[PDB]
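Consider this pair:
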Amino acid sequence: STGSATTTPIDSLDDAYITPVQIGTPAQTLNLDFDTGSSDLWVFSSETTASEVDGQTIYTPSKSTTAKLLSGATWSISYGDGSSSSGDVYTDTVSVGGLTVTGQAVESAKKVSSSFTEDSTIDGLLGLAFSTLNTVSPTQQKTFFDNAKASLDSPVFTADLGYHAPGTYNFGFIDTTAYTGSITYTAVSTKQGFWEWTSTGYAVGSGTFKSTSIDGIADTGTTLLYLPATVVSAYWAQVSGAKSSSSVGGYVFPCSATLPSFTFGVGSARIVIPGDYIDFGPISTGSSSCFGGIQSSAGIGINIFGDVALKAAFVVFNGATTPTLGFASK
């Protein structure tokens, strides 16, 4: 089997991407944030504290003839950005782009933190990291991909995120029309539960390539590109007037700037992030200070190849017995 679904930016900045997901019988379609940096499929629901729901579409398990309470199971997750959610668990039928999993753990939120409530466009998350990170207790549950894997034509999914435009998540096949040139594959460590890999270096603009190992994670659920302070300083030094602002929370730059590109290495291959992808717009409405899309990972504890990086590539998440990651230009 295979599946193919369009993923759409939630706003004009590509702050996140939502993908429609069918849950239950009859189908209840919710727009979920596909997150290769976590491993829980959770939704706003009829159980979510009413004051914490503001415009989201909810899953109502009592209206699904295939929903079953997973007795005794609870979940609770905290994300890198400080947001969180928790609740109980149902199993139900879940379909993405025509690919159906029966008995998928659907984690129903009883509580969500303010950032979730305040984002009316995201009805929940669909985790695509390794199932070892799943938070359900006392019996850990599998991700949608892990459940689907054996049925797939090939044990892979691909992320093809758009810049200020829709893109595609495919399951079970590689669309050879969706990228240019060849796909370069690189080793993955699953030791921390992430799609963790090592970039071979970087360049700023038309500058020379610096060969250096940068360990990080391919994370569709993180907006920005978080890299070591040395790398980030080298980038912003090429933008007149750019500075790190402790009050704003990172590097800002004059909105009048033209940003240089940023290149990262994948083996001997190179992925170029155009400068425009690094612009996250005014820090507040009407400001002439703009927020940068490349920020320091210092104090996160890991480098994160988030959407800024991934949307410059066609990315293969290869879930074979020994997982790997593939990157192609597009």
